[PDB]
Amino acid sequence: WTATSGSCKGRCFELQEVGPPDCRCDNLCKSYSSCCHDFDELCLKTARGWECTKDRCGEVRNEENACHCSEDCLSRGDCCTNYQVVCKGESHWVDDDCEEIKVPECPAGFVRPPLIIFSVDGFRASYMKKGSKVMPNIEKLRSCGTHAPYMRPVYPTKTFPNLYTLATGLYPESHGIVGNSMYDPVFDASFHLRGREKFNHRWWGGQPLWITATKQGVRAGTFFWSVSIPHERRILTILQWLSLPDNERPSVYAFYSEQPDFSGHKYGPFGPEMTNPLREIDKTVGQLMDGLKQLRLHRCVNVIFVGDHGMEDVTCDRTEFLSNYLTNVDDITLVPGTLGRIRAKSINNSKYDPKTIIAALTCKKPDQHFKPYMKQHLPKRLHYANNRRIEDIHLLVDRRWHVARKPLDVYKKCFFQGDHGFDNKVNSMQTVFVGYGPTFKYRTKVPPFENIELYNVMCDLLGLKPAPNNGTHGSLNHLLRTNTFRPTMPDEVSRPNYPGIMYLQSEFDLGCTCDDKVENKLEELNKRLHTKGSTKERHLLYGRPAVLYRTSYDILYHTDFESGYSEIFLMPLWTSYTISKQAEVSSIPEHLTNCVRPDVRVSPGFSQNCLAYKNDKQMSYGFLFPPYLSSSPEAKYDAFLVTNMVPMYPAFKRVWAYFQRVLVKKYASERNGVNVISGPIFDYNYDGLRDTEDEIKQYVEGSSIPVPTHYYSIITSCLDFTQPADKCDGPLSVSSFILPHRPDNDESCNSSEDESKWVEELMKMHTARVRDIEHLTGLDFYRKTSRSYSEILTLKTYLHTYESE
Ligand SMILES: *[C@@H]1O[C@H](CO)[C@@H](O[C@@H]2O[C@H](CO)[C@@H](O[C@@H]3O[C@H](CO[C@H]4O[C@H](CO)[C@@H](O)[C@H](O[C@H]5O[C@H](CO)[C@@H](O)[C@H](O)[C@@H]5O[C@H]5O[C@H](CO)[C@@H](O)[C@H](O)[C@@H]5O)[C@@H]4O)[C@@H](O)[C@H](O[C@H]4O[C@H](CO)[C@@H](O)[C@H](O)[C@@H]4O[C@H]4O[C@H](CO)[C@@H](O)[C@H](O)[C@@H]4O)[C@@H]3O)[C@H](O)[C@H]2NC(C)=O)[C@H](O)[C@H]1NC(C)=O
Ligand SMILES: Cc1nnn(Cc2cc(C(F)(F)F)ccc2CCC(=O)N2CCN(S(=O)(=O)c3ccc(S(N)(=O)=O)cc3)CC2)n1
Ligand SMILES: [Ca+2]
Ligand SMILES: [Cl-]
Ligand SMILES: [K+]
Ligand SMILES: [Zn+2]
């Protein structure tokens, strides 16, 4: 109950919301049908429109008017945005030459520059170029401030997941808004776009920017706007709040536009009808900047122009129907559209098997426009698994397509020509970022970055300490003139051992044989020095990674590679090696095909054995430093050490072998050498974080050799590809991946063909940031470079996406 008999006289858009049954006058009241009787009259005035005209100039203050052209208006702080233009001969902000803002030029009493976030739904990255003739205000911001070519959203590329990721710096899996539709099985509740359950605070995890601000003594303007409140009134309210007394005035504000997303759904991303929504957004931006300039705040305030996601061409004829794959289509529930989530309709039905459902959706048509997944097999870059609200079965839908349950759902519910929600690496889903103001840089292009990073930056812009989040704080320091956060390297927790020769061949009973019984003081002293670390400068280019958890490990040196060997997991955590442009691939000789050799620096009890692999019919084994790239027949023996061995399913070996035999050399040619660091990953609980020993669900049969869920590689070279990887004076270039370690290749529908037609394609899909790999291994890479740490942080968040321009 709301007793709406109270009034909004003097309370219009109040910043502290009052509790029922008292009526409300805040900018959300409309959405809860709880405004006071007079809210429309007093707070949503529209009389005489939104602009001063010559004849209104100097008028008598009429309080009924939407905005005022009277003489007193400036001091009341309620002029129309164009008042000084029309009535005082000033220019519009867009017509002024832009001039560097080296320091905040703010009115007295302002304790910090305010931050205004102008968020636009569906603003696809390519509109900045393609709509440039009709968006002059936005184009001034972009060219005079700091901008990226695009900003990467989070998956799913839907509105609520992305706006709340912008607000918190969290992946949807961690903040809880994992879609626009959701079911929580612990609550036994459903979250929808329509209706009231979305207003319950239990859905919304983490700490959004406005609560972070409030808690640390920074006043926040309320971020949300009810849909019926027109844009012009949202702007005027923000400008009103900026006129307030120093002790009541907020330091951070948000504007939200439902365009261009709303139109984009009807007319498609580039429909001729889309020009007009872009004109109107630009007009609104123009009103803000004109308003700020009136208040002498235009060289004081930091303005962020940011989108949540883009828009793709999607029509009703491009729908895949689960009814054309599943006989049992009525026993499931489908969250449909640009992604698919499948659970059982009834939890009482114990004859619901997700495996047979997955199998019925796998490679069944030759052009199939979706791929099903257990959520824990989704690419790790999506971070879309560790939440009870995300269904075990997921469908990644091809760009331009939909998935529905049955045809009746598509015609009983063609209307739309645009949609979004696809994989966040897809170009059409990319969105925008511009930063403009004293704390941002002048006329600066920055590289593409992910929207998870902005929460930290907005905290920095407001002098706030950010709540724990998934940004990498410091990775966007290059956007800022000052206010930068100065990060330190995390301290190494476990120092390594450096074992020498401590064991005789005969102490090992591994069941491993090798054809290596063949016999010199020139090449004996020389090989010792390789085992003590003479070529380590060659193979470990960026320092050894730091282990950031408590564990027991050994650094092992060799001619061609260097490893940090875990005595706990009985395999390397990492293997580092460099392949120059001119290095040569060789084969595995016939005498060494099944050769595995004891490592005399590591005890039998901390080594693997071959009998485990013999007795495990499912599990085979592979190598982290590839024998294929040994530098000499003598060096090749080092690659067959038991300490270079890792468990591999025969299906994964096809992948690994192709990567090691062909691709590594291919990349070395194309990039002028590469440093490679490869290793195992264990994420049985799919939280994106290194598992402890006691979380490992699978061992090689009859042993304590744990089985990785994934294998990673980090491939680094010189950004200036004229210089070789091993002699690079400048910025680095990196690409990486996290391959799921799977016993079949069902993910790759063309896997029965030659590895040259699908392997590289699989790797692309499972491309990763170094930072992803850090979370999963508890390692810290690039500890010793000649580069700044911020630059390295930027490099660690880089994702190689494999999309075109
Ligand atoms: C992205 O960044 C985020 C943010 O930094 C990272 O997530 C953090 O990971 C931490 C490590 O896993 C995690 O720390 C745990 O916190 C537990 C207390 O959590 C509450 O308090 C925080 C702080 O205010 C709050 O934010 C939490 O909110 C979560 O949960 C509610 C649901 O109840 C949601 O509303 C909210 O959206 C959020 O959900 C997300 O996180 C939870 C996990 O916290 C997931 O389950 C969800 O799926 C969702 O992703 C909470 O209200 C604390 O209890 C944990 O401690 C246990 O484990 C330690 C290990 O050291 C052990 O020693 C302790 O004994 C303890 O175990 C006890 O409970 C066990 C299970 O019941 C039991 O086995 C034991 O026997 C014990 O009884 C732990 O310290 C932190 O909460 C989250 N934070 C967030 C916001 O998600 C994330 O890792 C980053 N991602 C990547 C890839 O880097
Ligand atoms: C979603 C979402 N998550 N965070 N935001 C705030 C946000 C964040 C940014 C930023 F991160 F800075 F970029 C910019 C602009 C906005 C405003 C977005 C907006 O005005 N709308 C329209 C209104 N609704 S609503 O569904 O009616 C609704 C009402 C109340 C609640 S509650 N329970 O939190 O009180 C929840 C939903 C959400 C979308 N929206
Ligand atoms: Ca884990
Ligand atoms: Cl959804
Ligand atoms: K085997
Ligand atoms: Zn939309």
Swiss-Prot record:
GO cellular component: extracellular space; membrane
Effect listed in the UniProt record for changing T159S: 15% of wild-type lysophospholipase D activity
Residues binding 1-(9Z-octadecenoyl)-sn-glycero-3-phosphate, per UniProt: T159, N180, D261, H420
Alphabetized GO MF terms: alkylglycerophosphoethanolamine phosphodiesterase activity; calcium ion binding; lysophospholipase activity; nucleic acid binding; phosphodiesterase I activity; phospholipase D activity; polysaccharide binding; scavenger receptor activity
Chief localization: secreted
Expression sites by tissue: Abundantly expressed in cerebrum and cerebellum. Localized in secretory epithelial cells in the brain and the eye including choroid plexus epithelial cells, ciliary epithelial cells, iris pigment epithelial cells, and retinal pigment cells.
Region feature (Nuclease-like domain): 541-805
PTM characteristics: N-glycosylation, but not furin-cleavage, plays a critical role on secretion and on lysoPLD activity.
Gene3D superfamilies, per the entry: 4.10.410.20, Alkaline Phosphatase, subunit A, Extracellular Endonuclease, subunit A
EC annotation from Swiss-Prot or TrEMBL: 3.1.4.39, 3.1.4.4
Disulfide bonds: C8-C25, C12-C43, C23-C36, C29-C35, C52-C69, C57-C87, C67-C80, C73-C79, C98-C144, C106-C300, C316-C414, C363-C749, C512-C610, C514-C595, C718-C728
Residues where 1-tetradecanoyl-sn-glycerol 3-phosphate binds: T159, N180, D261, H420
Catalytic residues identified in the record: T159
Compartments where found: Secreted
Protein name stated in the entry: Autotaxin
Gene: Enpp2
